[PDB]
Design a protein around this nucleic acid. Structure first.
Lengths: 247, 268, 51, 282, 133
RNA sequence: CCUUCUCAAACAUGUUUGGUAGUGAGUGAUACUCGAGUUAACUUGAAAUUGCCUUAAA
């Protein structure tokens, strides 16, 4: 059975999400046209939130950066609109507890503005990147004697050499270097790697685990905020601590 | 802009029109300016922000001084940020506006609108008792959902955006200066999507005809440069209009980054 | 509704009706106890509420 | 049971206070009962080392938690830092399963196994509860042993870690060991030698071996996050232009030199030549 | 007597045609669901009608949702009497405006506004208003 | 049974500019520009009978 209160709440939340996406899309179209008399702001803001929490709002310098994006559960009673779902599917983030690497540019920024309330965005350190790749590294490999490929752990440097040797990628250390420095064949290595399947910070429904869930929800509500302002900065959090908890 | 003797005669005749011998005895004495424009003031997009026009003579101070003999007295509402509501009090405005006699009767934030005045009846009862509403320009963009649509059907209940922050921090000095400037020099006017603009000049009992003439001449001189206006009239409730201006030559105007981002984030 | 002995509250609806006070019979003295930080509660009342 | 009652009644603050006001069991008395002799503890810590180095390389799952994995990683790093600083490693053998180390600790030989940094798959056929019980016991035992060894060497335990160093590379270099001639030839091996380790070479293995048989290490992989170099440790089929003053060797030279004790000539180890067999020291 | 038509009132903002159909399809098959909306703006008038294949199902829906409290609204559900079909309930959308054609020439419109000005002069003369021009 | 655009840049604490599309129903008079766009103000419990992603899981 389905209750009318849940139906109405989902309708209202979906309507608000659609309105937010509409306003963001209009602002981005006017910014792209760049000849518009009427606009709110004409640049990009990054809000770094660290730890009783401190927030620093900075202008986006525009130089291409490296981000790690983790798909978290979205706002309550929201059915994901078509544009946000399309961007998430193109980023290969259709399910939660999944992370990918992203090359941050001026063209990438409006996509993050669209998909802000479903992801957490951070700057991965080298130790976190090495931990992610050497702990959870998987590829889709088609053997010579296998018709259909299956997903296996990134255990062979020979497979890396035979798949990305034309670009000049020999080993997993080379893949790490390419991802870290964002050089050539960065996209090739990034999509050679599968999206990373993390594990939940709190699992279980005993009394201790429910208390941990309550604390986690309180902390996430305190940290992450839903601006719904169509000019909001992109929130950047401590992805090192997040990956320590999730890996 | 407007001939001085012409506007003086029009004002004298219209103020004579009231004194020939409920709300019938009180509403028929409010002076209105009509501006007829060739095109829409705003354009194809609706606007809720009130334009501010500066005049030589004070307007709200005569309103406060003449509200002493009215059923609904003159009141001021102040809406500030939820994070800056704690940094001020009634004394923090009294000690700076006691010289000018400007009294802020109520200070609220968005939390009060969201919790205490959430209900429609309570919100209407709270809003309708204020004559001048001022709000911080940061929170003024969320007010169409908080104060509701009934509050925007009148110029007196429509909020006025004021600059409260100096150097990106809450400056009580800038807040007080903007409050004083709004209360003394400037008046609001709602720009509609049509071609007729109605300006509430005030009440005949508030000010003398000389002050009315000076204020309306300054308003006309300021609004001539703003747009390509077409006609100007002066009227009162239950009375016809009187022309004051006419121009002709202004009439002759009557006759993918998103996909690039998707490509950059996609592999093929 | 589950008060034993029932005489403790069997007169309450009539008293509320005679005094013109809105009342409601609810299931669970344990539920009312969670309301008032007790194990059980035979009755709860709202007198003053916020604006 | 009481926490469940508080949560069911909806007293979140009371539940938080109950969770704060709890005491957990410790295994220190059991450790002291089962190992009255520190030589007995040293003779038994080999299985503890194997289990901890296995669990420090596992990914986090529903059964195994990030806290447990991080604690195992910390204690393994502390053990490696102690061994490298006191210069006590004696034998190394790189087998297809992993790297076997033998080190002389307190007059006793300890042999343990370190797996490679690759995502091993969980079989979902083992008793993780039993293994985690063993892991808790082993963690307590090795905490006791590490405390005693650091104190007997005159060092502060637990050693502090450098946060930016751990952000660069999270290994034994993170923990700096503070206070308050070694035995030739293995400890004195690679003295006054600076090795530029290439990217494909295993940095943790090479750095641990060189630091235990003291030398300087310059990691190419450390330059991603952002002179004295005598040797460069590389493993590639074709190599680019080479520094004239720098000797270019393969990683097996280090292992063979450690296993021999004497300094094996570096001529027999070149990036474009065959390699001599890597014999087991045992 | 009673038909299979249900009148619903005091609806919240999120309750619309599709929401009502989705909710009451659990009670029974719906012949037609309509919601009163404003003609110029696409905003509901907070009441609507539904038709059930079974009048007994309509009666069950009424006795189930007669005084349901929903987001501060005490919903009201009535069974319409025998007959009394529902009619003329259009699903209006948010109307937009656009400038139409202006076929009168500049000279004709200037003459029209000058004649309006002369008419205003005549009206001021008629109403005993002593003003110039 | 969800919860509302809480601001930007230019110049020297100040001046200019952009940024705000609403619960519904009803009463009403009065003027302006082409069935359209505008125009004093009054009522009301949130009022109402028909304008053709799944560990917020069982």
């Amino acid at each position: 059975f389905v209750r009318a209160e849940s139906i109405v709440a989902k309708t209202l939340a979906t309507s608000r999400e659609k309105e937010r996406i509409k306003r963001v899309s209009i602002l981005e179209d006017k910014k792209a046209k760049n000849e518009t008399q009427h606009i709110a702001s004409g640049k990009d803001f990054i809000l770094k939130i660290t730890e009783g929490l401190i927030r620093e709002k900075t202008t986006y310098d525009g130089k291409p950066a490296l981000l790690f994006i983790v798909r978290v559960r979205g706002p309550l009673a929201v059915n994901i609109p078509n544009k946000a779902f399309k961007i998430l599917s193109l980023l290969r983030l259709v399910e939660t507890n999944t992370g990918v690497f992203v090359k941050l540019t001026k063209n990438v920024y409006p996509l993050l503005k669209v998909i802000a309330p479903y992801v957490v965005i951070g700057k991965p350190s080298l130790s976190s990147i090495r931990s992610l790749i050497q702990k959870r590294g998987r590829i889709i490999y088609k053997g010579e004697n296998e018709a259909e490929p299956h997903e296996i752990v990134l255990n062979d440097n020979n497979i890396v050499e035979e798949q990305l040797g034309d670009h000049g990628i020999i080993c997993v250390e080379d893949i790490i270097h390419e991802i870290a420095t964002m050089g050539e064949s960065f996209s090739v290595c990034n999509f050679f790697l599968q999206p990373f399947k993390l594990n939940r910070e709190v699992s279980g429904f005993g009394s201790l685990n429910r208390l941990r869930k309550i604390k986690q929800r309180e902390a996430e509500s305190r940290t992450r905020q839903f601006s719904n302002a169509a000019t909001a900065p992109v929130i950047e959090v401590d992805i090192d601590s997040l990956l320590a908890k999730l890996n | 802009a407007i001939p001085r003797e012409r506007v003086i005669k029009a004002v004298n005749e219209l103020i004579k029109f009231t004194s020939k011998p409920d709300d019938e005895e009180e509403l028929k004495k409010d002076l209105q300016l009509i501006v007829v424009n060739n095109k829409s003031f705003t354009g194809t997009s609706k606007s809720f922000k009130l334009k501010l026009l500066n005049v030589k003579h004070s307007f709200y101070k005569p309103w406060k001084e003449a509200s002493a003999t009215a059923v609904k007295d003159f009141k001021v509402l102040l809406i500030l940020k939820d994070s800056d509501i704690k940094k001020v009090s009634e004394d923090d405005l009294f000690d700076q506006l006691d010289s000018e006699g400007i009294k802020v009767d109520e200070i609220i934030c968005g939390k009060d609108l969201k919790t205490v005045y959430k209900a429609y009846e309570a919100r209407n009862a709270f809003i309708s008792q204020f004559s001048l509403i001022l709000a911080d320009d940061s929170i003024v963009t969320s007010l169409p959902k908080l104060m509701g649509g009934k509050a925007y059907n009148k110029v007196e209940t429509t909020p006025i955006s004021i600059r409260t922050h100096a150097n990106k921090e809450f400056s009580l000095t800038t807040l007080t200066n903007n409050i004083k400037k709004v209360y003394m020099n400037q008046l609001p006017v709602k720009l509609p999507r049509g071609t007729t603009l109605n300006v509430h000049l005030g009440n005949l009992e508030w000010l003398r005809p000389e002050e009315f003439v000076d204020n309306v001449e300054l308003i006309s001189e300021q609004l001539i440069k703003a747009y390509q206006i077409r006609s100007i009239f002066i009227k009162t409730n239950r009375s016809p209009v009187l022309p004051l201006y006419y121009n002709q030559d202004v009439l002759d105007e009557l006759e993918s980054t998103f996909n690039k981002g998707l490509m950059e984030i996609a592999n093929p | 509704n589950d008060v034993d002995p029932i005489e403790l509250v069997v007169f309450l609806p009539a008293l509320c009706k005679k005094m013109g006070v809105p009342y409601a019979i609810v299931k669970g003295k344990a539920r009312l106890g969670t309301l008032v930080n007790q194990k059980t509660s035979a009755v709860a009342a709202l007198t003053e509420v916020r604006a | 049971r009481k926490l469940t009652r508080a949560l069911g009644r909806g007293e979140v603050s009371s539940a938080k206070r109950l969770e704060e006001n709890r005491d957990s069991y410790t295994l220190d008395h059991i450790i002291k009962e089962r190992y009255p002799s520190f030589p007995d503890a040293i003779r038994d810590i080999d299985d503890a080392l194997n289990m901890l180095f296995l669990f420090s390389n596992l990914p986090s799952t529903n059964q195994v938690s990030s806290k447990i994995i991080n604690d195992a990683q910390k204690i393994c790093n502390q053990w490696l830092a102690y061994v490298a600083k006191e210069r006590l490693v004696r034998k190394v053998f790189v087998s297809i399963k992993g790297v076997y180390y033998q080190a002389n600790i307190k007059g006793e030989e300890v042999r343990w196994l370190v797996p490679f940094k690759f995502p091993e798959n969980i079989p979902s056929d083992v008793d993780f509860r039993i293994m985690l019980t063993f892991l808790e016991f082993y963690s307590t035992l090795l905490h006791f042993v590490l405390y005693k060894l650091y104190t007997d060497s005159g060092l502060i335990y637990p050693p502090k870690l450098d946060l930016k160093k751990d952000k660069i590379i999270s290994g034994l270099s993170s923990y700096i060991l503070e206070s308050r001639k070694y035995d030739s030839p293995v400890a004195s091996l690679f003295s006054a030698f600076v090795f530029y380790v290439s990217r494909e070479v295993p940095i943790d293995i090479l750095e641990f071996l060189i630091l235990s048989c003291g030398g300087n290490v310059i990691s190419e992989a450390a330059m991603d996050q952002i002179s004295k170099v005598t040797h460069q440790i590389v493993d590639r089929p074709v190599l680019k232009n080479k520094v004239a003053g720098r000797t270019y060797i393969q990683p097996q030279w280090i292992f063979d030199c450690i296993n021999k004790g004497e300094l094996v000539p570096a001529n027999k180890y070149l990036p474009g030549e065959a390699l001599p067999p890597h014999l087991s020291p045992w | 007597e009673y038909s299979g038509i249900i009148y619903v009132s005091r609806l919240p903002h999120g309750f619309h045609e599709k929401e009502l159909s989705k909710y009451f399809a659990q009670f029974g098959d719906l012949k037609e669901v309509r919601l009163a909306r404003n003609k110029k703006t696409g905003n509901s008038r907070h009441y609507g009608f539904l038709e059930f294949v079974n009048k007994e199902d309509a009666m069950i829906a009424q006795e189930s949702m007669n005084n349901y409290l929903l987001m501060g609204h005490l919903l009201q559900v009535r069974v319409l009497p025998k007959g009394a079909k529902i009619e003329k309930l259009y699903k209006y959308k948010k109307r937009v405006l656009v400038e139409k054609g202006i076929t009168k020439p500049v000279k004709q419109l200037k003459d029209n506004m000058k004649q309006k000005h002369e008419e205003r002069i005549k009206k001021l003369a008629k109403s005993g208003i002593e003003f110039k021009w």
